[PDB]
Every structure is written in C-alpha cells, then in structure tokens.
Assembly symmetry: C5
C-alpha cells in the first residue's frame, strides 16, 4: 500500500527572468507533510509531543531505522540551489513536517518569442518523486502552494497560477508522482515603447521633415544613416533574445524599416539622377509621390505585420 | 507559556545596492539572546561558568535533549548567505547567546523610480520566527540593532534607521514573530549632474550658439545629431534601471529633449524652405522668433515637468 | 575476476554552449548498477527488502566493511558540479543502484570553427573508472543513457547521440574503463542571417545604388565608411569566437569585403582623378566598368570562398 | 584560569588578486598564523608517540567542545562575501602551545578610498582581525617575524608604499574592550595607463585640432570643436565608470569639465568671427582671428595651472 | 629520520588564461605516494590487501592514530579549488596512494607584456609542504607529472614543460619542500593579425589612396578621423591587458600612428594654407613630398620599433 506525501510550493520572490538563457530564478519554500507510522514514538506525560530535527540528523535517524524517505528532485532546477532552512518536525503519530527554503534557477523551455515583445509565457517548477507511485503518491498540500505578494519583478506581470499533479518515468519503469507549479506572465511594454518604438518613430518622422527641403542628395545621406541606426537597433534587440532559429515579430519590424529605408535611398537616387540629366522639373513634379510614399509605406508596413502576426 | 527570543541585527557594510535587480547586499551580524531553563547546568569549581559551542554541536546537543530552538528565516534573503561566524555561548542559567556574522543579498521591492534620480528608497531585512508566538515571541534586543559608521557605499546615503516587531503567517495558521530592520536612503545626485545633466545642457547650449550663424541647413543637421545623442543618453539611463512598466522623471526629461529637438528640425526646415522659394528676407525676420524659441522651449519644458512631478 | 559496473548517463538540459570558452553545460542524471555480493543482506519479514542510503553513509558503510567502490571521475568536467541528488538503493541481492543528478560544465575541445557559422560540432562527456579493468569493467546500462526532449537550447540542434565504452590510462599503468556520451549538433543560421548577412548585403546594395549618382567623391566617402562598418562587423564576430590561430570561413568573408571595398576606394579615386585633369568624358565612359565591377566582384568573391571552403 | 591568555596573531598577504575601486574593495590570498599557549591542552606523551599532535580544525574544535575549553574566537570585521579556505591546520605541542594556520582567498571592504586626487593619489588598505571575546578573557599580541605583504603580489596598477601592523580595541558584541589586530598598507597608482590611454589622446585631439585653426575656416573650427565636445563627453563616460557614483568632484572630474568649458567657448567665439564674415566685416575677423588662434593654447595651459593650484 | 612524499601533478585542461588578471585556470590531478609504517595493517587470507578511504575518514583515522600527514598547500592558488575526487588507497605495507582532481585558478606573476603580442610567458603551479624537510621531503613521482593532450586552449600554445623540487620558508624557520610544475607558452598571432594589424594597415593604405585626389582639406578631415579610430584601437588593446606601469610594444605601435597621423594633419594644413595665399602651384610641387612621406613614415616607423624591441 503506497503512503501519501503532501507537496506544497510557494514562490516568495522572482529574483529575475533571464529570457536570453531561457530560465528564471525564484526564492521559494517547499512544504511536505508525510505520516510514517514507524517514525511515531512514545513520550512521558510532560515531555514534548513534537521532536524538531535538522535534515542532517533526521535522515541519519531514517537510515538507522531502515525507513525509506520520499526522495524527490526538482526536474527543471539549473545550477546550485542555495538552501536557507531545511527543518523537520516529527509528532507522537509519526507525521513528518518538512520545510525547504531556497533561492534557485529553473529551466523554462516554454519560451515562444514569436510575438516578442507582445508575448505571454509559461514558467513552471517540476517536483518529481524519485520513487514510483507503488511506494509514494504526491497529493496537493492545500492552502499553501502558489505565488506571494512581493515578487520584486517589474517587467513581467503574472496572469494566472495553477498547481496540478501528473506522472513521469525518469529513473523508474513504473509511473511516478510529479507536482507542478505553473504560472503565465506577460511583459510591461513601457520599456519597449520608451527605448525602442518612440526613438525609431522619432528618427523616421524627423527624417521625413527634411524631405520638404527638396535636396535629394540630403535625403539619400539621411536614409543611409537611418539604415546604420536600424542595423544598430537590430543588434540592441538581437542581444535581449537568444540566437533563435525563427523570426520574432520585432525581427520582422526591423527588416521592415530596412526594406523601406533601402528603397527611400534607391528612389531619391533616381529623382537626383533626373536633376543631373536636365530633367529637374520632372523630378520636382514626380517628387510629390516620394514625399507621400514615405509615410504611407511605414503605415502600409504597420498593417502588413499586424495581420501576418495577428 | 511562550519564551522570549531577543533579536538584534546590525549591518556593518553595504557592499552595494543593485537598483537594476531591485536588491542590496550587506555584511551584518545577527545576535539572539534566549533563556532555555532546560539547558541550565552546574559546574565544578575551576570549570568555566559559560560553555562555548559551534552551532554544529549546539544543535546536535538540542536534538539529543529534544529541546526546540527558535528556528528563524530571513524572509527577503536572496541566493547564498556566506556565514563568517556562527557561535553559541551557554551560561549556567541556561541563557543561549548566539552570533551569526554574514555577507548576503536581500530583496528590496520597495523601489519607486517615479522621481529617479531625485528619489528616497526603503531598504529592509525581515527576520521571521518559523514557529508561532504561542511558542516563541521575538523581543527587540536593545543596545545592538541598527547600522554602522563605515558602510562603504558612496551613491546612497541613509536618512533614518528603525527597528520594530510584527507578525507573519508564512508556514503557520497562527500569528508568528517578525523582527524588521528598515532604513531609508537617498541618492547623491553629483554623478547624475557631472555625467548626464551637465553634458545634455552643454550640448543644448553650444548647439544654440550655432543659431547665430543663420545657416538653417546647419541647424537641421545639428538638431538631427542632438536627437541621436539624446537617443543614446536614453539608452545610458535605460540600463541603470529595470524594464519598469512606469515612466521615470528621467524618462520624461529625455522625451522632453526629443519633442523639442524634433520641432527645432521641423521649424528650421520651414525657415530653410522660405529661403528656397525667394522669401529669404521673411525667414530672416521670422528667424528672430526661432532663435528665442529654443531657450524658452527647454525652460518652459523644465517647469512643465517640475510641476507635473512636484 | 572483475565485477561489471552498469553506467547510464542522460542529459536532461543543455543550459548553454559557450563556444568562446570551448565548453558546454548540462543538467544530467548518472545511473550506476553494481552487484556487490558482500553488501547482500537478509531481512526479518516486515523489514524492507531494499535499503535506501545517502551517498554519505553508504560510503562510510563500505569503508567499515572494507569494500572497494568503483570510484569514477568525469574526465572533461570543468569547475564545480552542483549535485541535486546522490541516492543509493541496496537490494537484498547486494545490487547497488546509484543516482547522481547534477548541473555541470564540460570541456569540448572537438571545436572546429573552419566552416563557422555553417559547422557541425562534437560534444561529449567522459566517465572514467579510476580503478583498472582487472578490478571493475564498465558496461552500457541500456534503456537510459542519451539526451532528453526539453534541452532548452535554441541555436544548436542535435544531429545524433551515441554511447560506447573504451579504455584510458590516466592514473593506472593498466587499461581502465571509460564510458562516453557523444552528441553532434549544428547551428540554426537564422541569427547569422538576420543580424550579419542581411545587414552587410543591405549596406553593400544600398551603397551600389549611389553609384548611379556619378559623384566619384561620394562613392569614395561611402566605401571609406563601409570599410569601418566591416572593420566593426569584424570585431562583432571576433568576440563570438576564441582567439583562434586559424582562419574561419566568416574570417575570410570579412577580409573579402575589406579587399573589394579597398579597391572601390582606389578605383573611384582614379575615375575622380581623370575628372580633375580635364578627362571627365573618359571617366564617364570607363565608369560603366566600375558600376558593373562592384556587384561582380562581390559575387565572383562569393564563389571564390564557396570553392576554397567547399 | 590564571587571568587572560595572550594570543599571537600573524597575517601575511601572499598576493593581491586585484583591487576593484568601483566596489571599494580588494581581494588578497593570505595566510593567518596564531600561537596560543593553553595549560589545560598540555598533555603527556607515551614514548613512540609524536611530541606534537596534528589536528584538522574540525576535529580540534570538536575536541575543545568535548573538553569544555573556550577558544579565542576571532572574526575579520571588514571581510566581504565568502572566504575560500586553502588550509585550516592545528599543531598541539606537549606544553599545550596551539599553532593554527589559515590560508584563504577573500575580499575585504575598504572605505578608506579618497578620489579627490584621482588619478594622482595614495590609498590606505587594511584588514581588521577582531577577537569576539573581550580583553579580560583574551589579549591579542603581534606574532613577530610573520605579519606583512609578500614579494609576488601580482598587482600591476597599484604599488605599495608602506606596511604597518598594530593592535587596538573594539566594542562590537561586548560592552568590554576587545582585541583588534590590524594589517594596514598604503599603495599609489602607476600613472602610465592614465597617460597612454587618457592624457596623450586628449592632448593629441586638442593639439591636432589647433592646427586646423591655421586654415582660417571658422565654420570648420566650429564643426571641429563641436565634435571635440562629444569626444570629451565620451572620455567623461570612460572615466565615470572606473569610479563609483561619488557625491564629490574628482580632480579628473574637474579636468574633463575644463575641456568642456573651453571647447564650449571655442565654439561661441568662432561662431562670432564667422558672423563678422557674414556681415561684410571679414577683414576685422581676420584681424581678431590672431587673438583667437593664441587663446586656444593659453586657455588650456591657464586651465592647467587653475586646477594644479586648486588641488595642490 | 624524514620520510619521502612522492608528488605528481598533471594539468588535463587549460580552461583559459585571463591575461588581464594575470592568472590562468586548469583542470588537474595531484598524485601523492607516501609509505607510513604505522598505517600498515594485517589481513586474514581472503580479506582485501588494499583499503580504499574517502579523504574525510582517512584523516579522522590519522588523527585517531596520532600520525602526522604531509600537509601541503598550493602556494599560487587563487579563490576556490573545486575538487572532483579526493581518494586514498592504503596497502597492507602502509603505502598511502592519494588522488586529488580539481579545477582551480593560479597566480602567474611571471607576465611580461614588453613584447605583447609577440611574447612567450611562464605559467607555474607551486605545491609546498607546510611541514619542513626535517619531517617530510617531497620527491618527484615519475611517469605522471606534466601536461595532457586536450588542454582545449586555442590562443596560447605550450613550448616546454619542466618539474623540479626546491625549498621555501613560508611558516617554518626550517627549509621546507616545494614541488614546481612550470610551463612556457606563446601566443598564436592570427587574432592580432586578422582583427588589429590588417584593419589598421587597411585604414592607413585606403587613406593614402585619397592623397591622389589632391584635396588637402579632405586629407586633413581623413587623418583627423584616422586619429579617433586609432584612439579607439588604443582602447580596444588597453582592455586586453592590465593597467601596466610599463609600455607594451603594441602601446608604442599605436603612439606611432598617433605621431604620424598628427603630422599628416599638420602638413596638409600647411599645403592647404599655401593654396589659400595664392601659392597653389608651389603646394602642388611640394605635394609630391607629402604623397611619398606618408608611406615612408609608417615603414621608417615600422623598422624603428622592430629595432628598439628586437
Ligand atoms: C538622423 C535622424 C535625424 C534627422 C534630421 C536631419 C539631420 C540628421 C543628423 O545628421 C545625419 O545623421 C545621419 C544618421 O547617422 C547620418 O547618416 C547623416 O549623414 C547625417 O547628416
Ligand atoms: C554636436 C553637438 C555639439 C554642438 C557643436 C556645433 C558644431 C557641430 C558639431 O558636429 C555635429 O555633431 C553631431 C553629432 O552626431 C552631428 O550629427 C552633426 O551633423 C554635426 O554637425
Ligand atoms: C576612414 C578610412 C577610410 C578612408 C576612405 C576615404 C574616404 C573617407 C571615408 O569615410 C570617412 O571616415 C573618416 C573616419 O571617421 C572621416 O574622417 C571622413 O571624413 C569620412 O568621410
Ligand atoms: C552607410 C551605408 C548606407 C549607404 C547609403 C548612401 C548614403 C550615405 C550613408 O551614410 C554613410 O555612413 C558612414 C558611417 O560609417 C559614413 O562614413 C559615410 O560618409 C556616410 O555617407
Ligand atoms: C576629430 C578630432 C581630430 C582633429 C582632426 C581635424 C580634422 C577633422 C576631423 O573630423 C572631425 O571629427 C569630429 C568627430 O568628433 C567630427 O564631429 C567633425 O565633424 C569633424 O570635423
Ligand atoms: N534532499 C531531499 C531530502 C528529503 C526528502 C524528503 C523528506 Br520528507 C525529507 C528530506
Ligand atoms: N538555525 C537556528 C540557530 C539558532 C541557534 C540558537 C538560537 Br538561541 C537561535 C537560533
Ligand atoms: N563520490 C562518488 C563515489 C561513488 C561512486 C560510485 C558508487 Br556505486 C558509489 C559512490
Ligand atoms: N573558526 C576558527 C576558530 C578558531 C581559530 C583559531 C583558534 Br587558535 C581556535 C579557534
Ligand atoms: N588534505 C590532504 C591531506 C593529505 C595529504 C597527503 C596525503 Br598522502 C593524504 C592526505
């Protein structure tokens, strides 16, 4: 007959989410309730009903009594887990109450940058029983598992928190318990506005003003610089993210400005060429297209992407 | 009956405050006084009245005597806590004197960048009893808790230090002790002056000089460069801070220069356009307005923000 | 007679591959099966058939019974190995079942940047027996060793995973077991396209447009800038990689643009020189060569490398 | 026992891994040596057993706990973060003289930093070793012939002027006066880097700029000095990062603003010369111009003595 | 009588050489052979001749038997040493065989950047006996100490490996053993060529082309830019190295281009000045000197340094 293990997990802090390395880091507390009849003991009346053990001696106790503990791993843990507290409280009955406080990093392979920066992502911690269900089944320790109030994370904000149970088959042939803490969060886009969109629009608009000079050479020299600017903005954003083998929304928007700004150069080159072959008057007539093409192309291009991605 | 636990905490050093990751790091000493009658002992004459234990053996002693120790966590601790000393002194009377020296990082989610760089911030360490008040109540260990003299931090300087007790309900249903060390500090604005304001004003002023040349094309080319400069200064500052979903004061000041410098372009474009359509004399008349718009706009804009934020 | 040790190793995560420091990092689980007759035990009915030990006490047990354990090292391990679980299960038969979960970095000196970024690389973990084959032989633990599904790595993608055994002679004169987990992976070229090729082609193309202006001075000033741009792109890429004593494909492609763009300068200098010595008409004739030389040389140069490297 | 026992503290820095002026700390590999005679620890030895017993710190402390003997607990007051230990080894003599060796790499807070004269300055580095227990229980004495700095420190920027050791009290955990052993050293910066990477360039920019005054294009001088400004604004960011977010003004801090003020005026001035040209007074400008050509060099060297007097 | 301790040390990997912090990091295995008669033991026939101990219990054994172990430090170790294996094999005869596998950083104060980047450097690990020679003398464990095959290091390549004994006087008055593993290595100049020399020569050469335009203003504007470029290249290289109080070869080469490029500016200023005072014809005569000065100056200057440094 297999004994129930009551798995509770609360994330107190999100220390940060490194989206480039596709992981996040949390301060968190794991809580386990587990009745083991064999661990139960007798007290004299007036001697305490509850024994408080360091994890160190509590396991050395279990080893001595040849009792199996419900050994568990965090499947998506990365690197070290700095433990704060690992503390056991045992009762007359042989109910074990375990607390594990830790800061640690976790894999989140559920990262989809397709709609970056307008994206919503799945973050989750997996807690697996090493031992199969035929020995230990995990049950939800109700009234504990979730996320806290002061997470300290300013970019992401969390949509929903859910806890669910399931199997794995990592070390066993047999089905084995896995407690899961999931959360979805999505980005506060202020940064992306204030530092990327606003500037790129400011560059584009203030550039368009200088079309009313009707120096075609100046427009060419301007758009040529704009190109390098965007090629930089392309490097800014490229670093935020991993070396993805797919094309971001952001990725597309940049190549947008590329294509346009490439043509702005080519077009004004041709207008300027007419001026150079005694057809200045034509250019100046023709020119009106070029002045109104500029802004339409960027706003035709705005709907082009917005439909392709939404 | 619940036994009193006397919690003292002194921050010797502030190793630094990482405002981007919304945490700070301190060298600090935790001091606990706790009378446990059961631990009291008799000595032979010539054998010491105070027994000095490593935390390691002191707990192994408590486990052996089935005595519960007032287990505590630092709630806002991040990552590892490098311990220097963990030393126990047990008096005849059964008074435990504990010392914990450590360097460690702590969450400070009390970060409000609304008035950055003119801001005052709350930094605090929480020390929680894991066990409820029905078992242990924390009392302020007088004559210890506070901040030192040589903190070593050059940017922030501390306004006020306060200590107080209160409850939590982290692992218990029952109310539980929490000792709090708060401090407020505010930024030394010298850096922000010397590296950000002075330059931006220098750029703006030295730019305005070149208005007295009365080349409109040159002013357009100048203000266009100024734009990119500010777009950079925008990236400098953006990195100091997190990816906030709210707009800094600083954030606004930058977009200020943006809006203005955008118009300086638009305006001089129009003056230059008049020159290009045989209305050079008009431009040169209007020009006088344009020369005295530059300085007013930046100083109209100075009061615009200084009213909006204060 | 030497006893068989059944070595399984599964990489759950690739935390990343630092190609500059010629190493990779993995979350992984090591599994060892090893029958030791001496460890075998009898149980009372109602006492467990399988005894579960912490590695700590399991070795202290082996030391006490003067039994030699099949000590192993990871030969290509770098720095610390953060252990998650080190857990032993001893059956009545005296079969030891060991599990070691860890995050760790490993050397991969099998790095050939000759065809970077179009390259396929060998990543491997070596597990050596410290003790010779005369004492312990390693055997492939079937049904476990390999790579998982959720590796979390976005740039590389894995072609093939193989396991095989072999000898070493690291500390012994005698032949000694070595279990090897190899994998090959190759790069997703999207990044290299979107951030390096597309820009460099965009710069080159939009530059060629400005040839139809037939300002030779402008072409010289342009190609001179292009040079510095490529000299930067040269620094971008240089950092991705180590300080290799061999020439990358990428390395060559950069020098290509160098040589060409150097020529464009020299050539247009000469065209411009003719203009300056009353031979403007000649230049304008010869110019047609220069206009079509530009694009040919970049695409002659494309086949030059694509033949030299393939 | 027979009053307070003397404890002989020796500390030698074998190397300085580096000095991070931005975090106002330094990191050293060092060996701490303590001599401490305890009558109670003295033991009788059977012939064929060594006269000196060699213990790991862990066993030696577990032994002290067992024998209910209090050891002279000590902390490094200015230690920062983790201290990796190389060796912790105890040798117990028949006489009961305890010999402890602690080898470690560690970072130490140093609030002694004064950037007022940066980069031309000397700074004070110190490690504090505080006894937790008061002076009435234990007094620290200088273990002579050991304390100091080594030969191969490995540090190329700083070079050390003087090493001094002395003892004093603290009152950290006790009401009672308590021992504190101090290892101080002063070092000062090698100016070559600051020359080769900051001064030489800034002078090169300034001088090569002044050459282009002999062109007598006023527009070109304006465009040049405007660029010079941005250059210095960069050099301002280079240096700003070397240092913390100080609330005071460095020497270097001042020197940068110097170039600012000057280069701002060079613009303003040539703007005015150019303005005369634009209002048919080209001849005047060309007269005045001679003042302007000699002003640039004077102002930079008037400005050199301005600071060198204000700061020295 | 003092007992011999057989010290072997093999570097398996060079994880890297941080030339800025004047240290290097290696994966390595320390091997010690040491006969202690007291550690010898008797076995029953059929009970093992060799006892295999964790370092942990092996020392607790030595402490119990009041035997002194040949305590050693790595003198030039920096920071933490991550240990892989610390394993003892005790024979009946009382021969201890010790293995210490570790990744660790080591000081190399033997750094001479005088001829950087054409330099050859000394890297060494010191292993000191804490105890004097009157108690333990170190002897070279032969057939093991040296460097491995797959070091993984791409910039440096190792010239020679030598091992030898010597004294120290670190904690003792008495002479004390020190085993030394030295190696020399020298740099692969490919990086320095491909990223620094080639570009600087490309800039200089492509600049010289624009002399054949015979625009003196353009040459001034060009050389002025070249200056800033080199001032950057000066910052690139400055960071590779520490804040050395001595002048590199590289250091000199840069100041070379400085001095020259400063004069190119001055000289063309003077040519241009002649044009401005009706002496255009003279300038155009003198010009031939200036055109052939530039190339000679850089190649006079190339031999100047190649003499002073070689
Ligand atoms: C740049 C957006 C602002 C537009 C306003 C018109 C003047 C622009 C400022 O100078 C221009 O900046 C480009 C970007 O670097 C350069 O390529 C170009 O040669 C230069 O003339
Ligand atoms: C530059 C701010 C300081 C004001 C000095 C006035 C003289 C002009 C200095 O050079 C300017 O630098 C910008 C920055 O990129 C260029 O874009 C711009 O076209 C260029 O004219
Ligand atoms: C720069 C090395 C390549 C030289 C090719 C000759 C044409 C000039 C190329 O662009 C130039 O870049 C320089 C560096 O900032 C500026 O001084 C210069 O005014 C600018 O036009
Ligand atoms: C730059 C590739 C875009 C080609 C479009 C033609 C118009 C000019 C583009 O700006 C150029 O940018 C360089 C910065 O490195 C400068 O050196 C160069 O003098 C400048 O004119
Ligand atoms: C540049 C300092 C070196 C002095 C050399 C004198 C020749 C002119 C070099 O080009 C200048 O470079 C500045 C970069 O700051 C540009 O902003 C400015 O428009 C331009 O005039
Ligand atoms: N490192 C996991 C140890 C452990 C597991 C379960 C329980 Br209940 C107590 C301790
Ligand atoms: N980890 C518990 C440490 C502790 C020791 C003694 C006292 Br009194 C309070 C706390
Ligand atoms: N430090 C790991 C030693 C070990 C190796 C294999 C087995 Br099976 C048990 C223990
Ligand atoms: N944690 C080190 C404690 C200690 C150090 C030196 C001596 Br002598 C005794 C004790
Ligand atoms: N910490 C290492 C101590 C030691 C030294 C030598 C040998 Br042989 C065994 C142990």
């Amino acid at each position: 007959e297999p004994s129930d293990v009551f798995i509770g997990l609360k994330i107190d802090q999100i220390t940060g989410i490194n989206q480039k390395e596709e992981n996040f880091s949390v301060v968190g507390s794991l809580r386990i309730d587990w009745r083991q009849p064999l661990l139960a003991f007798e007290h004299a009346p007036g001697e305490p009903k509850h024994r408080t053990y360091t994890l160190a001696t509590f396991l050395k106790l279990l080893e001595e009594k040849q009792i199996r503990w419900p050994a568990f791993t965090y499947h998506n843990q990365q690197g070290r887990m700095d433990f704060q507290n690992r503390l056991i409280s045992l009762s007359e009955d042989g109910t074990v109450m375990y607390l594990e406080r830790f800061t640690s990093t976790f894999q989140a392979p559920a990262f989809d940058f397709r709609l970056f920066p307008f994206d919503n992502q799945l973050f989750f911690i997996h807690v697996d029983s090493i031992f199969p269900q035929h020995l230990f089944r995990f049950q939800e320790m109700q009234g504990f598992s979730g996320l806290g109030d002061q997470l300290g994370e300013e970019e992401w904000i969390v949509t929903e928190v859910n806890t669910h149970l399931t199997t794995h088959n990592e070390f066993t042939k047999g089905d084995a318990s896995r407690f899961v803490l999931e959360f979805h969060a999505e980005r506060h886009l202020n940064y992306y506005l204030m530092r990327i969109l606003i500037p790129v629009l400011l560059i584009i608009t203030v550039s368009w003003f200088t079309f009313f000079l009707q120096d075609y050479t100046k427009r060419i020299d301007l758009a040529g610089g704009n190109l390098l600017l965007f090629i930089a903005f392309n490097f800014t954003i490229s670093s935020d993210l991993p070396r993805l083998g797919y094309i971001t929304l952001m990725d597309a928007f940049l190549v947008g400005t590329f294509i346009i700004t490439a043509l702005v150069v080519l077009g004004n080159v041709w207008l300027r060429r007419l001026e150079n072959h005694g057809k200045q008057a034509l250019a100046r007539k023709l020119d009106i297209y070029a002045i109104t093409s500029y802004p339409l192309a960027y706003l035709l291009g705005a709907l082009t992407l917005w439909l392709l991605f939404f």
